[PDB]
Design a protein around this ligand. Structure first.
Ligand SMILES: [Ca+2]
Lengths: 224, 57
């Protein structure tokens, strides 16, 4: 997260970390047993970490659980980045408590002007590298469809939308992928892509979660 | 060609460790790939990068 602030340690019980060698992507806890992330974050083996605040320090609250199933959207396209969403089934159900909890799925699509919360352990610099140990947050508004398309001519598909600032300075960055965009108590976005980070007229592009609610429900039931 | 291409993280926002050939160093070095896009100066392991690029393997 570039231009954000450090989250209260409680705060975002739905935020998860994906871990192969090390932390490489974020994700969102949508039930005991399922996590939403991005299809581009796909690995063959993944360990999910819940109740993290400082990923380099054992704090006593965390839950380490291996993925039993990793499922990319069947229509994900690696050239266009269309349908950049992925489901992960935990090999054991997470224990839901004060530090580890679910986030509602959307019941309406994102509305322009709405302030949202974006979070993750992503790079905090537009040029150069500075990866945080502690979770970062960012308040940012959903942008108009026109603002999104004018920023990325030829490239915004139906699965995409923009959140952030056209002037730059605040945005999500590398290692934030897969992570949550929450608006008024509902997961609206998955961190996906952008041209650089926090650059002028290049707001972050997010996967529109609302578009996949049926696919999520059905996939979960198919793999119970 | 591909061996002189700049290390490109790409547009996606994951963090994946890879290798590219650095012409100034005349050898391979680590970089963080973003998960998509970029170019072919992008190798899974050091050995493989040095295999394809530079020197006289
Ligand atoms: Ca920790």
């Amino acid at each position: 997260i570039v231009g954000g602030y450090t989250c209260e340690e409680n705060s975002l019980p739905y935020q998860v970390s994906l871990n192969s060698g090390s932390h490489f992507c974020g994700g969102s806890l949508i039930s005991e047993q399922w996590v939403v992330s991005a299809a581009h974050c796909y690995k063959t083996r993944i360990q999910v970490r819940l109740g993290e605040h400082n990923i380099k320090v054992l704090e006593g609250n965390e839950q380490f659980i291996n993925a039993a199933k990793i499922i990319r959207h069947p229509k994900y396209n690696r050239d266009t980045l269309d349908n950049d969403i992925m489901l992960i089934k935990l090999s054991s159900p997470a224990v839901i408590n004060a530090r580890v909890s679910t986030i509602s799925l959307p019941t309406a699509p994102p509305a322009a002007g709405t302030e949202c919360l974006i979070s993750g352990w992503g790079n905090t610099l537009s040029f150069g590298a500075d990866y945080p140990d502690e979770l970062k947050c960012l308040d940012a508004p959903v942008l108009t469809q026109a603002e999104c398309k004018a920023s990325y001519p030829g490239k915004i598909t139906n699965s995409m939308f923009c959140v952030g600032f056209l002037e730059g300075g605040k945005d999500s960055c590398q290692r934030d992928a897969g992570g949550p965009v929450v608006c008024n108590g509902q997961l609206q976005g998955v961190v996906s892509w952008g041209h650089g980070c926090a650059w002028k007229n290049r707001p972050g592009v997010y996967t529109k979660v609302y578009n996949y609610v049926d696919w999520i429900k059905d996939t979960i039931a198919a793999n119970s | 060609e591909v061996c002189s291409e700049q290390a490109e993280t790409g547009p996606c926002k994951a963090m994946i460790s890879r290798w590219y050939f650095d012409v100034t160093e005349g050898k391979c070095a680590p970089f963080f790939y973003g998960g998509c896009g970029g170019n072919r100066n992008n190798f899974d392991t050091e050995e493989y990068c040095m295999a394809v690029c530079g020197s006289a393997i």
